[PDB]
Amino acid sequence: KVDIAVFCQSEEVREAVGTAAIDRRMARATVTVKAGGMKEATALYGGVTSPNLVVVESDDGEARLMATLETLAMECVTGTKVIVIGRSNDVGLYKKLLDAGVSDYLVKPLEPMDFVAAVHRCF
């Protein structure tokens, strides 16, 4: 069973992610939703081993998003996949993230099927 950890602030993300977790296509995964974002994820994975997939909700600028992702990738155990949930719908940003090792980028508003799709895409 795949372990998934979701760090989100928005209720709309939390709801979409929650609806996606109870879906039949998400049977081979255990999703855990935690409050916060990058800071909370980085702080926790500094002491605790990261799960198979870490989903993080971030509204940060390109320069900051890249820097916070470098720091999170340092704490995560090799094999850990990262998905970023953001507000920006930019192809250039999506490309920069995918060249950095992010498995997928999800643009808000998040549909529960977008999250099921993104998880399957990763694996």
- 119 near 29, Cβ under 8 Å? yes
CB 4 within 8 A of CB 52: yes
Residue from 63, 123, 106, 48 nearest 115 by CA: 106
Tell me which method was used to determine the 3D structure.
Answer: X-ray
Q: Prior bond to 112 cis, omega within 30?
A: no
Q: Select from 3.40.640.10, 3.40.950.10, 3.30.470.20, 3.40.50.2300 the CATH code of 1-123.
A: 3.40.50.2300
CA–CA distance, 3 with 47 (Å, rounded to integer): 17
Of the candidates 103, 99, 106, which has an alpha carbon nearest to the alpha carbon of residue 79?
A: 103
Domain boundaries, the chain: 1-123
Burial of 92 (0-12, 13-18, 19+ CB in 10 A): exposed
